[PDB]
Design an enzyme around this catalytic site. Sequence first.
Site, PDB file in Angstrom:
ATOM      1  N   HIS A  41       0.812  -1.211   0.000  1.00  0.00           N
ATOM      2  CA  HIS A  41       0.000   0.000   0.000  1.00  0.00           C
ATOM      3  C   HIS A  41       0.872   1.299   0.000  1.00  0.00           C
ATOM      4  CE1 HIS A  41      -0.377  -0.462   4.591  1.00  0.00           C
ATOM      5  NE2 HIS A  41       0.417   0.588   4.397  1.00  0.00           N
ATOM      6  N   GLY A 143       2.236   6.110   9.747  1.00  0.00           N
ATOM      7  CA  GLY A 143       3.658   6.001   9.470  1.00  0.00           C
ATOM      8  C   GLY A 143       4.316   4.760  10.053  1.00  0.00           C
ATOM      9  N   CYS A 145       3.371   1.620   9.567  1.00  0.00           N
ATOM     10  CA  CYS A 145       3.248   0.481   8.681  1.00  0.00           C
ATOM     11  C   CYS A 145       4.604   0.069   8.148  1.00  0.00           C
ATOM     12  CB  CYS A 145       2.233   0.743   7.573  1.00  0.00           C
ATOM     13  SG  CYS A 145       0.513   0.561   8.107  1.00  0.00           S
TER      14      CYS A 145
HETATM   15  C1  LIG Z   1       0.088   1.897   9.276  1.00  0.00           C
HETATM   16  C2  LIG Z   1       0.334   3.128   8.421  1.00  0.00           C
HETATM   17  O1  LIG Z   1       1.408   3.706   8.462  1.00  0.00           O
HETATM   18  N1  LIG Z   1      -0.624   3.463   7.533  1.00  0.00           N
HETATM   19  C3  LIG Z   1      -2.003   2.947   7.594  1.00  0.00           C
HETATM   20  C4  LIG Z   1      -2.995   3.969   7.063  1.00  0.00           C
HETATM   21  N2  LIG Z   1      -2.604   4.434   5.725  1.00  0.00           N
HETATM   22  C5  LIG Z   1      -2.589   3.341   4.733  1.00  0.00           C
HETATM   23  C6  LIG Z   1      -3.922   2.652   4.558  1.00  0.00           C
HETATM   24  C7  LIG Z   1      -5.084   3.404   4.435  1.00  0.00           C
HETATM   25  C8  LIG Z   1      -6.317   2.780   4.349  1.00  0.00           C
HETATM   26  O2  LIG Z   1      -7.437   3.551   4.272  1.00  0.00           O
HETATM   27  C9  LIG Z   1      -6.413   1.396   4.349  1.00  0.00           C
HETATM   28  C10 LIG Z   1      -5.247   0.660   4.424  1.00  0.00           C
HETATM   29 CL1  LIG Z   1      -5.332  -1.070   4.239  1.00  0.00          CL
HETATM   30  C11 LIG Z   1      -4.010   1.263   4.550  1.00  0.00           C
HETATM   31  C12 LIG Z   1      -1.308   5.116   5.818  1.00  0.00           C
HETATM   32  C13 LIG Z   1      -0.223   4.158   6.297  1.00  0.00           C
END
Ligand SMILES: *CC(=O)N1CCN(Cc2cc(O)cc(Cl)c2)CC1
Lengths: 304, 304
Positions: A41, A143, A145
Amino acid sequence: SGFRKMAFPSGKVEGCMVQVTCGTTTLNGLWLDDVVYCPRHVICTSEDMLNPNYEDLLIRKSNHNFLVQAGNVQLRVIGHSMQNCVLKLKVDTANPKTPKYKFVRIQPGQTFSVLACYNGSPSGVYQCAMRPNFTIKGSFLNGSCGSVGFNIDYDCVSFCYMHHMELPTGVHAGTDLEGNFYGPFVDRQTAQAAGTDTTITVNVLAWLYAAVINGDRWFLNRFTTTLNDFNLVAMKYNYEPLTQDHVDILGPLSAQTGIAVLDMCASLKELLQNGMNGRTILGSALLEDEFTPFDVVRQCSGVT
Amino acid sequence: SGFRKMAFPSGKVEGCMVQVTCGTTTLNGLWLDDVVYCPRHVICTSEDMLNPNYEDLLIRKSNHNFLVQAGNVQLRVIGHSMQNCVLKLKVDTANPKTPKYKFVRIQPGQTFSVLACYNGSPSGVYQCAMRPNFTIKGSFLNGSCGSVGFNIDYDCVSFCYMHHMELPTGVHAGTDLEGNFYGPFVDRQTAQAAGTDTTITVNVLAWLYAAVINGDRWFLNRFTTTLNDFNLVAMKYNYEPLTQDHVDILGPLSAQTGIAVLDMCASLKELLQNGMNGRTILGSALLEDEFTPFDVVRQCSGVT
Ligand SMILES: *CC(=O)N1CCN(Cc2cc(O)cc(Cl)c2)CC1
Ligand SMILES: *CC(=O)N1CCN(Cc2cc(O)cc(Cl)c2)CC1
């Protein structure tokens, strides 16, 4: 003595954390040998998150679009590929800090340490468990992830988790290091059902053994039970059914304390039916289920 | 979201851990620059522990009696001295892995991470607090002495604790890195009184703010209180008195959530007077007091 929710020393993993940027998105990557692993992603914009076509989105990306930085030095991307929900970025330099490692897909009920990172930099380390509903109860902000979960056996790091998602319920979902999600979760902004979060019975029993070893004995009683009688109680309280494999795995703890597994089950049965009555066990007022029998033995023996 | 008892990444400290042996005794040392720091009880035999004359015992020891090993390589001891309850072993080699560091003597109520070690090798990392009675609730077995407690600000490691002792009550005592014990404890096998373990009020309130931020809001009520009214309740339940300095330190959390500090105190007052009624807050059935307001802000903002 003393019993704590203890995480593995994180040094071997800190030396693998890098920052991965694609377009306007930044998350963490894991640098092992000449490959950087990160959630796919990273190629998504906020507009394409309801239903992203990852194959179609990745077509528009070239090696030079993946900006990988280890500390303040830039890694040169010479290859990219998607394996399930992870991207594998081939770099021209093997990570000099690569420890001995394995990629393992853990079983629900198993524990691991998480090194929470932001922008490729570690913020903290905590111990958690893969829940029976395949979620984890972590601490992850935007951030984080690409932060990984791992276990350490002597000098070998077994990577088991990569953080990808937060469900609307505040619980966390992610993949193994082959990009396969634990559970039915998908890397999509959609309604995703976190199933019944059952309690890890074998872990609670192991923690009861750790309590006896470290002095907390108030909960020990004059009773015993059978696997089938105990499991009727465990079903009522959303506990995982206890199997003979679980009894066998508790064998060393039973041998050490002299308390038969079924006697400890009767203690757990009474605790389930009557509560703690305002008392605590190992500084907790609830039954702890994120310590495996292996974790208890490790902490009570001092394995490094 | 999510809130966990999180320890600092331990890498910078792992690279400082060495094994120190004197005669028949082995414990951990901390190698910073060309100095190895370790508990002075490394020179003791089990026979001389009731009342050891450390000055007299150290006279019989020469530089070659202190065996210091970093991994599988031997450090050459070129000097030795006792500073309070720690020995400082001067070695001929500066630790190449020495991070930016400071020695700090923490205040009761402050938190730190502990890297539990055995034979100079790290076993695990956990977060804990210096209790108001100057003890810590750790996890330390035989051989863990010399393991250190620390905090990390960006790239600087502030060492605050060195493990020395376990009281008959299962709680832990130790020194700062100048060898001064926290509390009235002495490195002697004698009857040592651990005082009243009071609850760190400002930390409980910070954790209540973390709970609101991460969704747990059941405990919020329609009431307010005053510092003096709250402190009558805090005295009754062995909580530390809340001061205006504590209210000021909770200011950023109050600003973030829009919940005035005294309103949160009234929530805490009702929780103290009525209990949780079988409910939980951030996965806990008791009021958590080992998260400082700084810890909550750090974890809720993602500082690396
Ligand atoms: C964990 C992290 O840094 N993030 C999670 C949220 N965003 C990515 C995202 C957005 C979303 O609506 C669904 C999913 Cl599966 C991932 C930014 C990165
Ligand atoms: C922490 C650790 O490795 N040790 C503590 C117990 N022994 C040393 C000791 C013994 C004693 O009776 C009193 C005191 Cl203050 C320390 C072995 C090392």
